Amino acid sequence: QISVRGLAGVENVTELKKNFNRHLHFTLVKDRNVATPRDYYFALAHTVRDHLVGRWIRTQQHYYEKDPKRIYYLSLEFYMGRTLQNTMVNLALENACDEATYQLGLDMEELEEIEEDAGLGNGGLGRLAACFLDSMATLGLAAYGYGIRYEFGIFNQKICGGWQMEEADDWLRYGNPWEKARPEFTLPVHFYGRVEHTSQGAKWVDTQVVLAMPYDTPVPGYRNNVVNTMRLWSAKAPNDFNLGYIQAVLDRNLAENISRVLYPNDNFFEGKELRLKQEYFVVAATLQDIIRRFKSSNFDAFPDKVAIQLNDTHPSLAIPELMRVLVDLERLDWDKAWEVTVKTCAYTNHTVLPEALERWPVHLLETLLPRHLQIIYEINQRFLNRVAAAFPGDVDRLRRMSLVEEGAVKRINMAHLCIAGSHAVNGVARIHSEILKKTIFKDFYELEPHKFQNKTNGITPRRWLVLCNPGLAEIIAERIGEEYISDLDQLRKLLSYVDDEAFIRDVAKVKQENKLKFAAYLEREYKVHINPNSLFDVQVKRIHEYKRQLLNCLHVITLYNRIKKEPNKFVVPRTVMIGGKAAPGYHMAKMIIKLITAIGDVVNHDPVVGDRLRVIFLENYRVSLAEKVIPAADLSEQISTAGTEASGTGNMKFMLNGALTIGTMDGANVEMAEEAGEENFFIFGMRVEDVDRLDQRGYNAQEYYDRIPELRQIIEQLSSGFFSPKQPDLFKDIVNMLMHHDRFKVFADYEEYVKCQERVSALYKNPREWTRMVIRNIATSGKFSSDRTIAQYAREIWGVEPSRQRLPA
Amino acid sequence: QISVRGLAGVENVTELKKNFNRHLHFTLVKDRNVATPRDYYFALAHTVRDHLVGRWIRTQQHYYEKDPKRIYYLSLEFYMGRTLQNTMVNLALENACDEATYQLGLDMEELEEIEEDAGLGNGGLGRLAACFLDSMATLGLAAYGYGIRYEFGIFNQKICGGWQMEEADDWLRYGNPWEKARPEFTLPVHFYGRVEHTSQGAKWVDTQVVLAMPYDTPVPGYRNNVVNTMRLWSAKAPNDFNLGYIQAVLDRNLAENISRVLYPNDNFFEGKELRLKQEYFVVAATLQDIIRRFKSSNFDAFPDKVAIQLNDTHPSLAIPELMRVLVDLERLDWDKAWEVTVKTCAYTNHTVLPEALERWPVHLLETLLPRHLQIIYEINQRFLNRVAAAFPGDVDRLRRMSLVEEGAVKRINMAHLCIAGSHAVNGVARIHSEILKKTIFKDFYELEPHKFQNKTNGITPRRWLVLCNPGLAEIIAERIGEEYISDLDQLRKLLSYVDDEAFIRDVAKVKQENKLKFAAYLEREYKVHINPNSLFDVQVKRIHEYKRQLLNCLHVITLYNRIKKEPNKFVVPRTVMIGGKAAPGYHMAKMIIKLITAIGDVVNHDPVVGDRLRVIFLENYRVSLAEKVIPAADLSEQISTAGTEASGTGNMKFMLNGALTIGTMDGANVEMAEEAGEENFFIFGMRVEDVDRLDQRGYNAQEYYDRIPELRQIIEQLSSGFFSPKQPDLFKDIVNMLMHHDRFKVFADYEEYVKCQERVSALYKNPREWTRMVIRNIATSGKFSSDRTIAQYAREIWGVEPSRQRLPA
């Protein structure tokens, strides 16, 4: 029906129908009489996956023949979402499958809704890994994603009485048609034990063994016939494990628990042994796999054939593990091993919040990984010798830069380990990378300035435009062709349409259709009703104090109080939508969810308000939900305290899909405003420098409370029980935090935020001018393609050239 | 190459090759460059399983249309072995697949060796269930096998220093191509909780829920296009289970442990809570499935449409569970519910050893299954009221017959429950069924004589002749056609060939070839060497004192001592093979294994013995090993103390495959001798009556030691450390048991056994007469087909007619 979804040729449609019926019969063992809708989904998934096979085999044999430098992207998170539509998109099969299923009497969109998200990540860091895999395949790089196959991904969030409840995400229950188990590449991973010193080197002995079994998932490039691999490890007990008899068999669970569940903390470090085991498990298995592949091509050439990218410090044990293998097993001298390690590894930092940095207690590494601790001590000694020689007599520099932190419990600073052992260190947006050089890692930058880079984040325009917003993709393609899908900078061509009345109409129409579709989704699957003519004001992202969902809450209550004060004045109607999961042990984030729903309970049932203001909490925010809500949004809320959000990627998704942004000058927001023009962005609030100034003289929230009467009213409503009549003191913790211990200065940005929101309402009253500003945002979103990001990693870090050329079909 | 393996037509061979290549590519994602031998096995398994699909769908739709009475065979064990060859045999595909793989450059037999046994049983009881499924499908009955899908089956046995070591049988590691998960028929099973009484009935509340997920495995009939289902339940935690967060997810293992591992006790009861949970789990899920299927056809008609066969007392909770559903959920009155239950259920007993009978402590049922305990008390009260009315004043009868056993701990006698709640009770061989009426269940037989039946055990001639011994099957088919494969009584026709010189030669030749093949197997995969001209003397079965592997050991040492006494006399050379697993907690059985290997260590390295006597312990005896060794055997050792082996089925396998039998008049041995003629069987030892007489006056082993000098020598060799020079007292427990507490009267049968063994050696010196006696055994083995057994269950218990007619192809 629409052009960018590909051809529906008669031979292809006929073949798809035939293969669908074959899988339903021979694979699922069903006929049309008994087949459940889930069966039809699986028949389609098997039909589509068949098309990946030849390309997957020939891609991997091509890398074997050509032997290019291989890129290994190590991450504890890969937030993939659904795979069916994405695979159709990248193979140009969407229209053909739509037609084939139509002719079989089935609605493809309904079948798509049956697929479980692969929710193997928490938020931005996990989703970045996923966008990256897509871009690496689209750019023809010999790339492999390596991670853990968690049996349970991020929990499903249910809201009960306004409170978050967690349930297990049993995503493999029905089986995963997108993975192939590879038991023949099963590898042993070692834990505990002790170090023995002999005449010729150290030996790690008396270890416990866990097996690492790999599962391969295809990663198709966009219409280039490239299919790369994401290899995820699953933990298996050896067969002689604990081998009264019954108990020994049941105890296999202890070993297999390593790959059981994703830790649900976003930007927070928890020093739990099971998490450390997960980190080593992925690193040990991956490195053996890498080395095995390299030998099937002398370690001088290792860095010419291997790049390892560490996604934050979670896989930081790769550094001492590589040293361990090179020194203990291969018998290289320390200095040569070290040279190889440094040239091989690169590190990407994703946060500056101190509570998020990994600092592992020494006693934990001592017991679990005794040889790695010894290697880390040796790395530290040699590194600090270099610091002492460069900055003679600077004894405080020595303690600041040490990988070993002194105190009550001695800890290892994993970020310091990553910097010492990597040839490149990057932040994820220009302002974040600057903050790294100026504050957090200032000492390291002074020692080795050449190591520090920026690589501004991006998103894939395949999932985040073509897949989720075909209507917008189509009206764009009608004017500029479809080359922009893998060359997003071409969207600049749309600037010459900003005065085109047909395009203005079409852009506004597509947004309207998306909003109608989302309004319908809400009624059908949540029995909740909304006005589709209102401004859709959306903040979706994990719940964190730094992200300031609370600031948004204050604005919502402000609008409610103004309406109640002057009921008969006109206000631009809004649907305010907030969604996101809270980490299970994060009390304040759970209280914020409760506040949001409690505000909704008052606002949504006030007769005087009518349909002028609605507050909805979007339950179970995840990749599939984002694909629905982002295309429907008018206003994107990106309101973190300046200096706290390293980049953001949600911001970029909204920009690409025709929402305007209200935001602080934080993370990639700065670069977004710079690309679009500050006139085309709703910027408010303290800059980083303003935050610094306030910290110096001291942040007194009371001052704001005292001079802003509208703010005072809200605090008094919260305190007195206006939003919780049966438990009047319910929100006391929130009020006390705001008044006395707010690290994120919510009150300080309140006035500017409200005034900026008034300017948004003003522009939305003028549909034509709203839409022209939207066009200027979409047209300048090109920089934020992860294809650009990956091309920069490739050229400036990995030392490889991207290729847009297609492999034989 | 051989006729009974079917046709290798040009179209079929071409199609198989094509589909093999398709699965290797599209299913396994491999090409011929990287494909492992395991990959080739899977490609073949998928190619063969494709042929089951249409037949499986049409069989099940046929049962839906015709609505015949359904047979539900409930067992905690299904000892299936490998599935690939069996499926080819039953579909007539063996020659075609042999040819197709040959043309692809592959050896099919080598691919067959890659398949894991489905080892979901311990021994005879589990293997009986498997033979039964085959016969039910071959006889066109609407039958379903229901059990548990254990993640770990019977342990793999390794012998280390002559001692048994157990390792986990991780049989699902590579995935099982013969099962289809059916998540849409997932059912809840309830545990713990409490009983609440209301105005209208009892209610079972506050329960913990475990989910039962079914996996279906096809059971093909022999060339009749019937494909029945074996449905095995797997335990799954609900998603809100235990729902700090991490621990709650890891604790799901506690619920899922129910289906983790098969209890490895053969003929021994262990009152462990996990075992009780397994028994209820299979019963609760199965009964809901049965009832659901019945409603998709008023409970008066229930027994006309449903038969439930209880394989021993392990699924005895079906009786109170059916009552529970009928009374509590469907609101039938007690007496009507009871009538339905009794007419529906039948019970098969498999043992008379008191330590094997299930007697569950009341306190365990009280906590785990409070409502079932109440129902059991009520059943008992009403039953004992009937006993009191039939035998007024007989107060000891009342205590003897009670389902509740008094004592230190009150227990429930599950066998008494089964008798009370079933319309039929059967033993598994004529002598065993007689023993049930005369001793163990005498009181019950006097109350309800009509309930008691015999159904002599059988084995399937598909697996146990055609599959494992194609050479023998072929020379038979050459003379009498191939109808005997599903009508085994036709083997009587072979009696007119007992004087045929060509047939005599062919029978002897096939045995020789089988022995050469097995001698080669032993060298290749165990580096052990044997003389293929020797008499192959085989005892394979689980290790138990009652089975008297120890009596066999005494004979072996006797032969060794005689050789050493007169080294230069001629003796018929023997290879004595003993194999079987010991239950992990059964100390004496583990000591017997150690004795066997210790005897081998002395005998096999004595230069004076040469190749005249060899003693081999066959490691890891299981269904696949039985298929190899049974066709190779000359002498079958079936030497249990009279009255202890209920039937035996191993005995029948050897008879069908051309071994002669040395045995006591125990279990089915009696009926075997009766069929073949006592002159054609090597019978020795006490009859049941002789055992009874000895028990009355008291068994004194010392008497035998005192008057048999050859026996005295052996005991002195054992005691003094002749067979364990470094640990002279190693076998003290064995000697003390033999001398002072032998329940199985090993010494009492010693003299007769040795003399009978001399007669065996004498006949083996005359090849022509040995073979004529073999022909007389094979020719009269027809009675022992499980087709006969199942036809009797069908007509005399289930009330259904078997059909040899084929369904549309």
Ligand SMILES: OC[C@H]1O[C@@H](NC(=S)N/N=C/c2ccccc2Cl)[C@H](O)[C@@H](O)[C@@H]1O
């Ligand atoms: O269907 C569920 C099972 O599927 C198996 N996949 C098999 S057999 N082939 N996959 C082929 C494949 C896989 C991915 C992409 C393309 C193809 Cl063409 C996985 O190994 C199991 O771990 C999983 O449980």
Ligand SMILES: OC[C@H]1O[C@@H](NC(=S)N/N=C/c2ccccc2Cl)[C@H](O)[C@@H](O)[C@@H]1O
């Ligand atoms: O670069 C991608 C995105 O990365 C995010 N970081 C995240 S989700 N870290 N999770 C860290 C984490 C995850 C799990 C466990 C412990 C921790 Cl400590 C940043 O906050 C975003 O500003 C940025 O856009």
Ligand SMILES: OC[C@H]1O[C@@H](NC(=S)N/N=C/c2ccccc2Cl)[C@H](O)[C@@H](O)[C@@H]1O
């Ligand atoms: O390959 C391993 C996986 O296979 C799956 N089987 C599928 S998809 N089809 N089976 C079809 C089938 C099954 C049996 C007989 C004939 C056919 Cl035609 C099982 O449901 C999984 O539990 C198992 O792990």
Ligand SMILES: OC[C@H]1O[C@@H](NC(=S)N/N=C/c2ccccc2Cl)[C@H](O)[C@@H](O)[C@@H]1O
């Ligand atoms: O009828 C088939 C065969 O049944 C065997 N019984 C067996 S394996 N019981 N296992 C009982 C068992 C099994 C598991 C756990 C506890 C127990 Cl208590 C008989 O000993 C044979 O003489 C007979 O041929």
